[PDB]
Coordinates of C-alpha atoms and ligand atoms in Angstrom, one line a residue:
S1 CA -270.8 133.3 -28.4
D2 CA -273.6 130.7 -28.2
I3 CA -271.1 127.8 -27.5
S4 CA -269.0 130.1 -25.3
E5 CA -271.9 130.9 -23.0
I6 CA -272.9 127.2 -22.7
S7 CA -269.3 126.1 -22.0
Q8 CA -269.0 128.6 -19.1
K9 CA -272.2 127.2 -17.5
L10 CA -271.1 123.6 -17.5
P11 CA -271.6 122.1 -14.0
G12 CA -269.3 119.1 -14.4
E13 CA -272.0 116.7 -13.4
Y14 CA -274.1 113.8 -14.7
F15 CA -277.7 112.9 -15.3
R16 CA -279.2 109.6 -16.4
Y17 CA -281.0 108.4 -19.5
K18 CA -282.4 104.9 -19.2
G19 CA -279.9 104.1 -16.5
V20 CA -276.8 105.5 -18.3
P21 CA -274.7 108.5 -17.1
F22 CA -274.5 111.5 -19.4
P23 CA -272.5 114.8 -18.8
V24 CA -274.9 117.7 -18.0
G25 CA -275.0 120.6 -20.4
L26 CA -273.7 119.1 -23.6
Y27 CA -276.4 116.4 -23.6
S28 CA -280.1 116.3 -22.6
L29 CA -283.0 113.9 -22.4
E30 CA -284.3 115.5 -25.6
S31 CA -281.1 115.3 -27.6
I32 CA -280.4 111.7 -26.6
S33 CA -284.1 110.7 -27.2
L34 CA -283.9 112.4 -30.7
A35 CA -280.9 110.4 -31.8
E36 CA -282.4 107.2 -30.3
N37 CA -285.8 107.5 -32.0
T38 CA -285.2 109.4 -35.3
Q39 CA -286.2 107.8 -38.5
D40 CA -283.6 109.7 -40.5
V41 CA -281.0 107.0 -41.2
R42 CA -279.9 106.8 -44.7
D43 CA -278.4 103.9 -46.8
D44 CA -275.1 105.8 -47.4
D45 CA -274.8 107.3 -43.9
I46 CA -271.6 106.5 -42.1
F47 CA -271.4 106.2 -38.3
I48 CA -268.3 106.1 -36.1
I49 CA -269.1 104.5 -32.7
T50 CA -266.8 104.2 -29.7
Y51 CA -266.6 104.1 -26.0
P52 CA -265.1 107.5 -25.0
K53 CA -261.3 107.9 -25.4
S54 CA -260.8 104.9 -27.7
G55 CA -259.4 107.0 -30.5
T56 CA -262.6 108.4 -32.1
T57 CA -260.7 111.5 -33.2
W58 CA -258.3 109.3 -35.1
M59 CA -261.0 107.4 -37.0
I60 CA -262.9 110.6 -37.8
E61 CA -259.8 112.2 -39.3
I62 CA -259.0 109.0 -41.3
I63 CA -262.5 108.9 -42.9
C64 CA -262.6 112.6 -43.6
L65 CA -259.4 112.1 -45.5
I66 CA -260.8 109.0 -47.3
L67 CA -263.9 110.8 -48.4
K68 CA -261.9 113.6 -50.0
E69 CA -259.6 111.0 -51.4
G70 CA -256.4 112.2 -49.6
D71 CA -257.0 116.0 -50.0
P72 CA -256.3 117.7 -46.6
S73 CA -258.3 120.8 -47.6
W74 CA -261.5 119.9 -45.7
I75 CA -259.7 118.8 -42.5
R76 CA -257.5 121.9 -42.6
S77 CA -260.3 124.4 -42.9
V78 CA -263.3 122.8 -41.1
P79 CA -263.4 122.0 -37.4
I80 CA -263.5 118.2 -36.7
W81 CA -266.8 118.3 -34.7
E82 CA -268.4 119.9 -37.8
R83 CA -267.1 117.3 -40.3
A84 CA -268.5 114.4 -38.3
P85 CA -271.2 115.7 -35.8
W86 CA -272.3 113.8 -32.8
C87 CA -275.7 112.1 -32.7
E88 CA -276.6 112.5 -29.1
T89 CA -275.3 116.0 -28.2
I90 CA -277.7 119.0 -27.8
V91 CA -276.6 120.3 -31.2
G92 CA -276.5 116.9 -33.0
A93 CA -276.2 115.8 -36.6
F94 CA -279.9 115.1 -36.4
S95 CA -280.7 118.7 -35.5
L96 CA -278.7 120.3 -38.4
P97 CA -279.4 120.9 -42.1
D98 CA -278.1 118.4 -44.8
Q99 CA -274.6 119.9 -45.5
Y100 CA -272.7 116.9 -46.8
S101 CA -273.6 114.3 -49.4
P102 CA -272.6 111.1 -47.7
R103 CA -273.3 112.0 -44.0
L104 CA -270.5 111.2 -41.5
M105 CA -271.6 111.1 -37.9
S106 CA -270.1 110.1 -34.5
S107 CA -271.6 108.6 -31.4
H108 CA -270.6 107.2 -28.0
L109 CA -274.1 105.6 -27.4
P110 CA -274.2 102.0 -26.2
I111 CA -276.2 99.7 -28.5
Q112 CA -279.4 99.7 -26.4
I113 CA -279.7 103.4 -26.9
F114 CA -278.1 104.1 -30.3
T115 CA -280.5 105.0 -33.1
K116 CA -283.0 102.1 -33.2
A117 CA -283.9 102.7 -36.9
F118 CA -280.4 101.6 -37.6
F119 CA -281.0 97.9 -37.2
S120 CA -283.2 97.7 -40.3
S121 CA -281.1 100.2 -42.4
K122 CA -278.1 99.7 -44.8
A123 CA -276.2 102.5 -43.0
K124 CA -272.6 101.7 -42.2
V125 CA -271.1 101.5 -38.7
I126 CA -267.4 101.4 -37.8
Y127 CA -267.0 100.4 -34.1
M128 CA -263.6 101.1 -32.6
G129 CA -262.2 99.6 -29.4
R130 CA -259.1 100.2 -27.4
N131 CA -257.3 98.5 -24.4
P132 CA -259.7 99.5 -21.6
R133 CA -256.6 100.1 -19.4
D134 CA -255.3 102.9 -21.7
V135 CA -258.9 104.1 -22.0
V136 CA -259.0 104.6 -18.2
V137 CA -255.8 106.6 -18.2
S138 CA -256.8 108.8 -21.2
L139 CA -260.2 109.4 -19.6
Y140 CA -258.6 110.3 -16.2
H141 CA -256.4 113.1 -17.6
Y142 CA -259.0 114.3 -20.1
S143 CA -261.5 114.7 -17.2
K144 CA -259.3 117.2 -15.4
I145 CA -259.4 119.6 -18.4
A146 CA -262.8 118.7 -19.8
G147 CA -265.5 121.2 -18.7
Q148 CA -268.4 118.8 -19.0
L149 CA -266.7 116.1 -16.9
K150 CA -266.5 116.2 -13.1
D151 CA -263.0 115.9 -11.6
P152 CA -261.7 112.3 -11.5
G153 CA -260.5 112.3 -7.9
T154 CA -257.6 110.0 -7.0
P155 CA -256.3 107.5 -9.6
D156 CA -257.6 104.8 -7.3
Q157 CA -261.1 106.2 -6.8
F158 CA -261.5 106.9 -10.5
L159 CA -260.5 103.4 -11.3
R160 CA -263.3 102.0 -9.0
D161 CA -265.8 104.2 -10.7
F162 CA -264.7 103.1 -14.1
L163 CA -265.0 99.4 -13.1
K164 CA -268.5 99.9 -11.9
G165 CA -269.5 101.9 -14.9
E166 CA -269.9 105.0 -12.8
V167 CA -268.7 107.2 -15.6
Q168 CA -270.1 108.9 -18.8
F169 CA -271.8 106.5 -21.2
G170 CA -271.7 103.7 -18.6
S171 CA -269.7 100.5 -18.4
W172 CA -266.9 99.9 -21.0
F173 CA -267.6 96.1 -20.7
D174 CA -271.3 96.4 -21.5
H175 CA -270.5 99.0 -24.2
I176 CA -268.2 96.8 -26.2
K177 CA -270.0 93.5 -25.5
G178 CA -273.3 95.0 -26.7
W179 CA -271.9 96.4 -29.9
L180 CA -270.0 93.3 -30.9
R181 CA -273.4 91.6 -31.2
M182 CA -273.4 93.2 -34.7
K183 CA -270.3 91.3 -35.7
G184 CA -271.2 89.4 -38.9
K185 CA -273.3 92.0 -40.6
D186 CA -271.6 93.4 -43.7
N187 CA -272.5 97.0 -42.8
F188 CA -270.6 96.8 -39.5
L189 CA -266.8 96.9 -39.0
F190 CA -265.0 96.3 -35.7
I191 CA -261.5 97.7 -35.5
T192 CA -259.1 98.6 -32.7
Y193 CA -256.8 101.5 -31.7
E194 CA -254.1 98.9 -31.4
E195 CA -254.5 97.8 -35.0
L196 CA -254.2 101.4 -36.3
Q197 CA -251.0 101.7 -34.2
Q198 CA -249.6 98.5 -35.5
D199 CA -250.3 99.1 -39.2
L200 CA -252.0 102.4 -40.1
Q201 CA -251.8 102.0 -43.9
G202 CA -253.2 98.5 -43.5
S203 CA -256.0 99.6 -41.3
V204 CA -256.8 102.5 -43.8
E205 CA -257.0 100.0 -46.6
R206 CA -259.5 97.8 -44.6
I207 CA -261.6 100.9 -43.9
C208 CA -261.5 101.8 -47.6
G209 CA -262.7 98.3 -48.6
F210 CA -265.4 98.4 -46.0
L211 CA -266.7 101.7 -47.2
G212 CA -266.3 100.8 -50.9
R213 CA -263.9 103.7 -51.5
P214 CA -260.5 102.4 -53.0
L215 CA -257.6 104.8 -53.1
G216 CA -254.4 105.1 -55.2
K217 CA -251.0 104.8 -53.7
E218 CA -250.9 108.5 -53.6
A219 CA -254.2 109.4 -51.9
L220 CA -253.6 106.4 -49.5
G221 CA -250.2 107.7 -48.5
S222 CA -251.8 111.1 -47.9
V223 CA -254.6 109.8 -45.7
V224 CA -251.8 108.0 -43.7
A225 CA -249.5 111.1 -43.5
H226 CA -252.3 113.4 -42.2
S227 CA -253.8 110.8 -39.8
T228 CA -250.6 110.4 -37.9
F229 CA -250.6 111.6 -34.3
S230 CA -248.0 114.3 -34.9
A231 CA -249.8 115.6 -38.0
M232 CA -253.1 115.7 -36.2
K233 CA -251.7 117.3 -33.0
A234 CA -250.5 120.2 -35.2
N235 CA -253.8 120.7 -37.0
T236 CA -255.7 123.5 -35.4
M237 CA -259.0 122.2 -36.8
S238 CA -258.5 118.7 -35.5
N239 CA -256.7 119.2 -32.2
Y240 CA -259.5 121.0 -30.4
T241 CA -257.5 124.1 -29.5
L242 CA -260.3 126.3 -30.8
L243 CA -262.8 125.3 -28.1
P244 CA -263.6 127.8 -25.3
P245 CA -261.1 127.5 -22.4
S246 CA -264.0 126.6 -20.1
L247 CA -265.0 123.6 -22.3
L248 CA -261.4 122.4 -22.6
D249 CA -258.6 123.9 -20.5
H250 CA -255.8 124.3 -23.1
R251 CA -253.8 126.0 -20.5
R252 CA -253.6 122.7 -18.4
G253 CA -253.6 120.1 -21.1
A254 CA -254.3 118.8 -24.6
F255 CA -257.0 116.5 -26.1
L256 CA -254.3 114.7 -28.1
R257 CA -252.3 113.9 -24.9
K258 CA -249.8 111.1 -25.8
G259 CA -251.2 108.9 -28.5
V260 CA -249.5 105.6 -27.7
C261 CA -250.5 102.1 -26.5
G262 CA -249.5 101.0 -23.0
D263 CA -249.4 104.3 -21.1
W264 CA -251.5 102.4 -18.5
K265 CA -248.4 100.7 -17.2
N266 CA -247.1 104.1 -16.1
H267 CA -250.3 104.8 -14.2
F268 CA -251.6 101.5 -12.7
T269 CA -249.9 100.3 -9.5
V270 CA -249.5 96.5 -9.5
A271 CA -252.4 96.2 -7.0
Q272 CA -254.7 98.2 -9.3
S273 CA -253.6 96.2 -12.3
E274 CA -254.4 92.9 -10.5
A275 CA -257.8 94.2 -9.3
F276 CA -258.5 95.3 -12.9
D277 CA -257.7 91.8 -14.3
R278 CA -260.1 90.2 -11.8
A279 CA -262.9 92.6 -13.0
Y280 CA -262.0 92.0 -16.6
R281 CA -261.8 88.2 -16.3
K282 CA -265.3 88.1 -14.7
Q283 CA -266.9 90.5 -17.1
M284 CA -265.3 89.2 -20.3
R285 CA -265.7 85.5 -19.5
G286 CA -266.9 84.3 -22.9
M287 CA -265.5 87.0 -25.1
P288 CA -263.1 86.4 -28.1
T289 CA -259.4 87.4 -27.8
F290 CA -258.5 91.1 -28.4
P291 CA -255.2 92.7 -29.4
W292 CA -254.8 94.1 -25.9
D293 CA -255.1 90.7 -24.2
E294 CA -251.6 89.6 -23.2
Ligands
A3P301 N1 -253.9 110.1 -34.8 C1 -253.8 109.6 -33.6 N2 -252.8 108.7 -33.3 C2 -252.8 108.1 -32.1 N3 -253.6 108.4 -31.0 C3 -254.5 109.3 -31.3 C4 -254.7 109.9 -32.6 N4 -255.8 110.8 -32.5 C5 -256.2 110.7 -31.3 N5 -255.5 109.8 -30.5 C6 -255.7 109.5 -29.1 O1 -257.0 109.0 -28.8 C7 -257.4 109.4 -27.5 C8 -258.7 110.3 -27.6 O2 -259.8 109.4 -27.8 P1 -261.2 110.0 -28.3 O3 -261.0 110.7 -29.6 O4 -262.1 108.8 -28.5 O5 -261.8 110.9 -27.3 C9 -256.2 110.1 -26.9 O6 -255.4 109.2 -26.2 P2 -254.4 109.5 -25.0 O7 -255.1 110.3 -24.0 O8 -253.9 108.2 -24.5 O9 -253.3 110.3 -25.6 C10 -255.5 110.7 -28.2 O10 -254.2 111.1 -28.1
PLO302 C1 -272.7 121.8 -29.4 C2 -271.4 122.3 -29.7 O1 -271.2 123.5 -29.6 C3 -270.3 121.3 -30.1 C4 -268.9 122.1 -30.6 C5 -267.8 121.3 -29.9 C6 -268.4 119.9 -29.5 C7 -267.6 119.0 -28.6 C8 -266.1 118.7 -29.2 C9 -265.5 117.3 -28.9 C10 -266.2 116.3 -28.0 C11 -265.5 114.9 -27.6 C12 -266.5 113.7 -27.8 O2 -265.8 112.5 -27.4 C13 -267.8 113.9 -26.9 C14 -268.5 115.2 -27.3 C15 -267.7 116.7 -27.5 C16 -267.6 117.1 -26.0 C17 -268.4 117.7 -28.4 C18 -269.8 118.0 -27.9 C19 -270.6 119.0 -28.8 C20 -269.8 120.4 -29.0 C21 -269.7 121.1 -27.6
NA303 NA1 -263.6 118.4 -15.8

């Protein structure tokens, strides 16, 4: 009833924190500032960082499974947003009592705003990226049913806003370019939605190594089985169907929409695709090659 009241008051608008757009209602100057300036970063803390709609939910479920060594009990009985709380939200992981030994947290904050005390910590970060074209599409549909987000408008107008960073959490380009500046540190891992799609078991093993949490063939296969799109779409605790209708309109759509790579080709017209490549080419001039670069 506390979250139900809040959800019904969501305006579907934005406000700015240090030049970056944040959805009104689920975030505030205070909540963001807290996550940015807190000193409570621990050596064994684990952070999942992503630009919205890059497959955060996927990574979160994978690690929740890894932590319990393949046992689905925790993901079956505890809602996902409670198993890996968000740093910047009004009710963040930093404004809640210690309820888990190794803390698992999530964030969409770009590097210049993410918890500053992190740079001198031993805490671990897994940054996940996805083809920005599929990100646009996923974000377009999600916005129509997401209470905190304003309506997208036309596919074409929404695409222009995306390219100019006129969306929640700012520019995708700046987001990923900034975070890749951590590449090289041993407490930072960069992985992509595309890699998990290509070889989920392989990706899971890499994440186990990175976290220092090896798994037997059994637990491994379990993490994989329960991390699959179909399995997660059917898990009431992970698929978001428990949220208030005003926060997420279950009646009109689902958080786990399609779960594939390439759905952008069914939404971008050729002209929009060409305009996107021009923007990408100019913004990603010196960047390394990514799986989504064809
Ligand atoms: N286990 C899984 N396998 C594949 N895609 C998954 C997934 N869990 C979530 N996703 C996809 O990740 C996107 C949500 O991203 P995020 O969690 O960062 O908000 C959605 O993309 P689509 O809208 O393309 O289906 C969703 O379906
Ligand atoms: C504070 C609170 O009640 C929690 C419970 C459900 C949580 C939401 C559940 C899922 C998401 C998706 C994520 O990409 C951004 C934040 C957001 C939108 C959470 C914000 C904080 C919420 C609203
Ligand atoms: Na909306």
